[PDB]
């Protein structure tokens, strides 16, 4: 896989961000994770985490997987990186997202994220208490 440039337009919630990609605005949905909705427990803490990560980054990048690039809602599906650090992994590592929506052909970083979830769970973090 490989990283392509994008700029933050707006952080939306824990697992969705509006980015400008190849010069067009697009909502991106973070592969392989599930943050709570904003109205759910740790929903607000998830939104804040992603909003800070992406807004503070000097450099946002998107990395598509080997399968479907847009979901049925026209959202882009990608691994999202902020100054080289994967948002999707960081959310799981802090127990602000569960590993979820693992579809075949779009699951390159599954076990890296599962490894992060296991640590979060061992540490009894946020979602895991």
Ligand X SMILES: Cc1cn([C@H]2C[C@H](OP(=O)(O)O)[C@@H](COP(=O)(O)O)O2)c(=O)[nH]c1=O
Which of ligand X, Ca ion, none has residue 128 at its interface (CB below 5 to 8 Å by kind)?
none
Give which of ligand X, Ca ion, none residue 38 binds (C-beta under 5 to 8 Å, depending on kind). Answer: none
Residue 31 near ligand X by CB under 6 A: yes
Task: Choose the stretch contacting Ca ion; rule: CB under 5 A; options: 21-29, 34-42, 69-77, 117-125.
Answer: 34-42
DSSP string across the chain: --EEEEEEEEE-SSSEEEEEETTEEEEEEETTEEPPPTTSTTHHHHHHHHHHHHHH-S-EEEE--SS-SB-TTS-EEEEEEETTEEHHHHHHHTTSSEE----TTS-TTHHHHHHHHHHHHHTT-GGG-
Rule CB under 6 A: say whether 34 interacts with ligand X.
Answer: yes
Asked if 63 touches ligand X (CB under 6 A), the answer is no
Is residue 104 part of the contact set for ligand X (CB under 6 A)?
no
Which CB, 77 or 83, lies closer to ligand X? 77
113 contributes a contact to ligand X by CB under 6 A: no
Tell me: is residue 65 an annotated ligand-binding position. no
């Amino acid at each position: 896989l490989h990283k392509e440039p994008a700029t933050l337009i707006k952080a939306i919630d824990g697992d969705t961000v509006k980015l400008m990609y190849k010069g067009q605005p697009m909502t991106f949905r973070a592969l392989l994770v599930d943050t709570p909705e904003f109205n759910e427990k740790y929903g607000p803490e998830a939104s804040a985490f992603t909003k800070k990560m992406t807004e503070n980054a000097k450099k946002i990048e998107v990395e598509f997987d080997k399968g479907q690039r847009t979901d049925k809602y026209g959202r882009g599906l990608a691994y999202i990186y902020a100054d080289g650090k994967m948002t999707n992994e960081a959310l799981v590592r802090q127990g602000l997202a569960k590993v979820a929506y693992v579809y075949k052909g779009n699951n390159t970083h599954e076990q890296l994220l599962r490894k992060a979830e296991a640590q979060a769970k061992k540490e009894k973090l946020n979602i895991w208490s």
